[PDB]
Design a protein around this ligand. Structure first.
Ligand SMILES: CN(C)c1ncc(Cl)c(Nc2ccc3c(c2)CC(=O)N3)n1
Ligand SMILES: CN(C)c1ncc(Cl)c(Nc2ccc3c(c2)CC(=O)N3)n1
Ligand SMILES: [Cl-]
Ligand SMILES: [Cl-]
Lengths: 4, 123, 123, 4
């Protein structure tokens, strides 16, 4: 999971 | 927004759609290319091709279970492109590049047409 | 194999499937969650959820146009998860994380359950 | 396009  | 994103989600979705295709699950159309028949999901075809997008948004054609392609279309070129639609992988070879480019131009798959043009220009 | 790969293909496919959903094109099922109704593509639901995968591979349920979820399922939690299925983006917030995790456990969306567990453990 |  990432900060888009 | 303040959303988080799962990097592999789109690839995992496509992998599962290809697993459904390989098992013939919820396929709703057969694409006829000369003597050859290819089963697929209308939504995936539309998502990948400007031609299928136009066909299946048509109020009459959206209901057809069989679509016949132009007789000039090569079944192997179509097969390579159908595999690309479901995997992101293009089996581009010296012996198939002309049939692949011609099929991609007909199917309106702009990114495939672009890589074929570049690979032909190099040789 | 000797294939080449188009990096953005899976993301572009998912973006187009979401465009079809937003325009209600080729949606083939309605998911009922309490009073709320959500239209979707069976194939995308199966590709994202272990629960929908089981439902639509069933020889009888594969033909249903309406699926009713357990009354304990929260419509907002389902909406956030349906958006995630079609975008890879999860709108996870303090006020919805418990409903999102419970819905993801019911839908069998393992990666969402994992990030909810980690975000809850941090607080 | 890349070599996967
Ligand atoms: C253009 N548009 C709004 C849209 N929405 C949904 C879908 Cl499924 C769609 N697909 C599509 C249309 C044109 C093209 C492609 C997909 C690939 C391409 O090279 N051209 N295009
Ligand atoms: C497991 N399998 C062969 C498979 N093939 C096709 C599809 Cl659409 C599918 N989808 C699915 C099954 C289980 C789970 C998911 C999707 C997401 C998850 O967390 N669990 N799973
Ligand atoms: Cl393309
Ligand atoms: Cl997930």
């Amino acid at each position: 999971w990432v900060i888009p | 927004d303040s959303c988080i994103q799962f990097t592999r989600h789109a690839s995992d979705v496509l992998l599962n759609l290809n697993r459904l295709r390989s098992r013939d699950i919820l396929t709703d159309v057969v694409i006829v290319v000369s003597r050859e028949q290819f089963r697929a999901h209308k939504t995936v075809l539309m998502a990948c091709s400007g031609l299928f997008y136009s066909i299946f948004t048509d109020q009459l054609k959206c209901n057809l279970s069989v679509i016949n392609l132009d007789p000039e279309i090569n079944p192997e070129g179509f097969c390579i492109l159908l595999d690309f639609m479901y995997t992101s992988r293009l089996n581009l070879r010296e012996g198939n590049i002309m049939a692949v480019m011609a099929t991609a131009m007909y199917l309106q798959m702009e990114h495939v047409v672009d890589t074929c043009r570049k690979f032909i220009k190099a040789s």
